[PDB]
Paper text:
Recently, we described a novel adhesin termed the Adhesin Complex Protein (ACP—NMB2095/NEIS2075), a conserved protein found in the OM of meningococci, gonococci, N. lactamica and all other Neisseria spp.. Nm-ACP acts as a minor adhesin, mediating the adherence of meningococci principally with epithelial cells. In summary, we have identified a new function for Neisseria ACP as an OM-located, surface-exposed lysozyme inhibitor, in addition to its role as an adhesin and as a potential vaccine candidate. ACP is found in all pathogenic and commensal Neisseria spp., and despite structural similarity to the MliC/PliC family proteins, it shares no conserved motifs involved in lysozyme inhibition.
Crystallization trials were initiated on the purified protein, and native data were collected from a single crystal to 1.4 Å resolution. The structure was solved by single wavelength anomalous diffraction from iodide ions, following a soak of a crystal in 0.4 M potassium iodide. The overall fold of Nm-ACPI is close to an 8-stranded β-barrel, stabilized by a disulphide bond between cysteine residues on the first and last β-sheet. However, there are few main-chain hydrogen bonds linking β4-β5 and β8-β1, meaning that the structure divides into two four-stranded anti-parallel β-sheets (β1-β4 and β5-β8). The interaction between β8 and β1 is stabilised by the disulphide bridge between Cys38 and Cys121. The computed surface electrostatic charge distribution showed that the face of the β1-β4 sheet is predominantly basic, whereas the β5-β8 sheet is more apolar, apart from the loop between β4 and β5. All three structures superposed onto Nm-ACPI with r.m.s. deviations of less than 2.0Å, and all preserved the same eight stranded β-fold, although sequence identity with Nm-ACPI was less than 20% in each case. In addition, we noticed that loop 4 from the MliC/PliC family proteins, which occupies the lysozyme active site, corresponded to loop 4 of Nm-ACPI, but was longer in the latter by 3 residues. The sequence motifs SxSGAxY and YxxxTKG, which were conserved in the MliC/PliC family proteins, were not retained in Nm-ACPI. Interestingly, the face associated with the N-terminal region of Neisseria ACP and opposite to the predicted HL-binding site, is highly positively charged, which could provide ACP with the ability to associate with negatively charged surfaces and possibly mediate attachment to the membrane or capsule surface.
Residue numbers in the entry: 30 to 99, 101 to 123
The structure:
């Protein structure tokens, strides 16, 4: 099961993100279209905690958000590039 959310961020940047959900109701990935290219970021269970979910791996793009269940449309997000610069900042749905 997929669900898509459109966001507006700092400096007017816009991004659409698609979240995958398994049969347990947990998210498995976040897929963001960045310069026209689909960037799929797998959920990072080692880095996720009671307040924040992270998607992505070292060397790739990394998405950070709140706790995601079928909650997900009310969460803010941020996306950091491989160089560690926050390229989508303070994003709201
Ligand atoms: Na980069």
């Amino acid at each position: 099961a997929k669900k898509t959310v459109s966001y507006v961020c700092q400096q007017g940047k816009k991004v659409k993100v698609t979240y995958g959900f398994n049969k347990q109701g947990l998210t498995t990935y976040a897929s963001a279209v960045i310069n026209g290219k689909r960037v799929q970021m797998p959920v990072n269970l080692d880095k996720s905690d009671n307040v924040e979910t992270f998607y992505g791996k070292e060397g790739g793009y990394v998405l950070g958000t709140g706790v995601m269940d079928g909650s997900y449309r009310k969460q803010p997000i941020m996306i950091t590039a491989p160089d560690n610069q926050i390229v989508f900042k303070d994003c709201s749905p």
